[PDB]
Structure 1
Amino acid sequence: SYDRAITVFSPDGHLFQVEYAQEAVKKGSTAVGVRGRDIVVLGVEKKSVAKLQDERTVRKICALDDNVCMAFAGLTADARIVINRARVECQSHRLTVEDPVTVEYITRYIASLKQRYTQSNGRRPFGISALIVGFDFDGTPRLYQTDPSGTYHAWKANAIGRGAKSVREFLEKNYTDEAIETDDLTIKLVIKALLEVVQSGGKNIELAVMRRDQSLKILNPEEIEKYVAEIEKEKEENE
């Protein structure tokens, strides 16, 4: 067996393998998640849309369970392992406690799984960051973000990927109680956040939504194009 310390402390006290894994996240597609009142929203930039690419197979928004889904940013191959590992534990938790997994628990397990790979012999850290969204058993919307180090935090709205810093700056200024008053307004906030880094427009936006007591719903391109027209229309009257 390969038993070698891949992740070791730098003399300054940094785990460089963790930091390098976080750099791979910054090279991934921008994923934006906004937690509303009665709906949770995940928006993922589709990078480059080749007309010969089956959009069904390449999907950065995946459902761990009937009430929890996450969008990632980083190495696509690494994320799928985390998603499958979380999906297996989603069913293990359900068979044991006879209750669907809370958004904290699946975020905690994924983060703990990430940290284990930063302190185990022969394993490099996972180079992906996850935007976990869902609803608890009491109906409270919850949005969580994990990073390759293994730390997890709850966010009202957050962005991961190449344009995370600009979008999070945008989300800091526009995320208000009024902006999440209705489901449509919550959807428009993600598109406004995504359009700050997405250049062409709604063609490179993949938006998926989850409502309380409902499964994850992927928005069709026409629905997204319908929303983009509304922001474009609303831009004129504000000028």
Structure 2
Amino acid sequence: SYDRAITVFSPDGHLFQVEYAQEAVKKGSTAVGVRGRDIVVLGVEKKSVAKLQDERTVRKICALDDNVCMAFAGLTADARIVINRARVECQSHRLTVEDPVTVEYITRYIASLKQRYTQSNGRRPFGISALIVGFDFDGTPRLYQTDPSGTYHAWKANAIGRGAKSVREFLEKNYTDEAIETDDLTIKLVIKALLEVVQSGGKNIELAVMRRDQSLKILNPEEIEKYVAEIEKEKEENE
């Protein structure tokens, strides 16, 4: 019945065109992310190379500033505008105020820019959801998330994309109150979490970590293959 407008309400108080934007997020590849003691980590799945293209232009993980990362879902066009806009704000903040940009400040900019972009008619909202991970604000690891309605929010372990309900239910029975120290253990938690992929091919995982002091460290498909081997080593205790 009545939706076809972002300014009208339902007879029971809903915004269906805002709610339909979250349905476009569920067509994307899943991406998870946890925070740890010092090393934060986020991984993505469903690479699926097609035998005839270069793979350095299909990247889903980018950095806004020197100590903040980004992972998204949804459709690829609307993510490029939000990424390119957020690089300007996290650089123009440094010019007006000489501090580095906190991880909390950049998520309020993305949410508020998506906020006013929902209110006026003739402005189709962004059909993306994002994960902002950064251990930037004075040695403290944090990770937030966004929403197409424009609500920034903080979790401690996150999953999005096509099949987030299984992974988020998986991590509640898996994320121990025992803090995952010896950070390869924390990386092995993500590879165990990403092991419940839509097909779990093993070579379709692109994990990216950050040791909170260096830059981004994109893992190679030889170090990640070693972590996939030790996951099968712990699986030998079932018999």
Verify the 8 A CA contact 2:33 2:159 in the aligned structure 1.
yes
Taking structure 1 as reference, are residues 7 and 66 closer, same or farther at Cα in structure 2, changes over 3 Å only? farther
Residues 41-82 of structure 1, C-alpha deviations (whole Å, 9 max, x = no match): 111113423232322111111101111111001111111111
- Give the TM-score normalised by structure 1: 0.93
Residues 163-217 of structure 1, C-alpha deviations (whole Å, 9 max, x = no match): 1111111111111244621210111111111111242332111111111111111
Does the alignment pair 1:161 with 2:161? yes
Q: Once the 2 structures are TM-superposed, how far is the Cα of residue 10 of structure 1 from its aligned partner?
A: 2.7
Q: Give the root-mean-square deviation of aligned CA atoms.
A: 3.0
Verify the 8 A CA contact 1:179 1:189 in the aligned structure 2.
no
Distance 1:148 1:10 in 2: 19
Verify the 8 A CA contact 2:103 2:137 in the aligned structure 1.
no
Verify the 8 A CA contact 2:75 2:127 in the aligned structure 1.
yes
Q: Once the 2 structures are TM-superposed, how far is the Cα of residue 26 of structure 1 from its aligned partner?
A: 0.7
Distance 1:137 1:3 in 2: 42
Q: Once the 2 structures are TM-superposed, how far is the Cα of residue 238 of structure 1 from its aligned partner?
A: 4.5
Q: Which moved more, 1:50-59 or 1:62-71?
A: 50-59
Verify the 8 A CA contact 2:6 2:121 in the aligned structure 1.
yes
SS in 1 for 2:119: coil
Taking structure 1 as reference, are residues 192 and 175 closer, same or farther at Cα in structure 2, changes over 3 Å only? same
Residues 122-174 of structure 1, C-alpha deviations (whole Å, 9 max, x = no match): 21110000011001331110110101011111111100101111111111111
| Residue pairs, 1:90-169, within 5 angstroms | 90-169=90-169
Q: Which moved more, 1:148-157 or 1:44-53?
A: 44-53
Distance 1:140 1:156 in 2: 13
The number of aligned residues is 239
Distance 2:233 2:168 in 1: 24
Distance 2:149 2:3 in 1: 20
Distance 2:119 2:227 in 1: 45
Verify the 8 A CA contact 2:135 2:212 in the aligned structure 1.
yes
Give the structure 2 partner of residue 82 of structure 1. Answer: 82
Taking structure 1 as reference, are residues 37 and 238 closer, same or farther at Cα in structure 2, changes over 3 Å only? farther
SS in 1 for 2:129: strand
Give the structure 2 partner of residue 41 of structure 1. Answer: 41
Q: Which moved more, 1:140-149 or 1:176-185?
A: 176-185
| Residue pairs, 1:60-71, within 5 angstroms | 60-71=60-71
Q: Where is the strand percentage greater, Structure 1 or Structure 2?
A: 1
Taking structure 1 as reference, are residues 221 and 9 closer, same or farther at Cα in structure 2, changes over 3 Å only? farther
Q: Which moved more, 1:48-57 or 1:148-157?
A: 48-57
Distance 2:118 2:38 in 1: 36
Verify the 8 A CA contact 2:103 2:133 in the aligned structure 1.
yes
- Give the TM-score normalised by structure 2: 0.93
Q: Once the 2 structures are TM-superposed, how far is the Cα of residue 20 of structure 1 from its aligned partner?
A: 1.0
Stretches of 4+ aligned residues off by more than 3 angstroms: 1-8
Q: Which moved more, 1:170-179 or 1:14-23?
A: 170-179
Q: Which moved more, 1:171-180 or 1:95-104?
A: 171-180
Q: Which moved more, 1:195-204 or 1:218-227?
A: 195-204
Name the % identity.
100
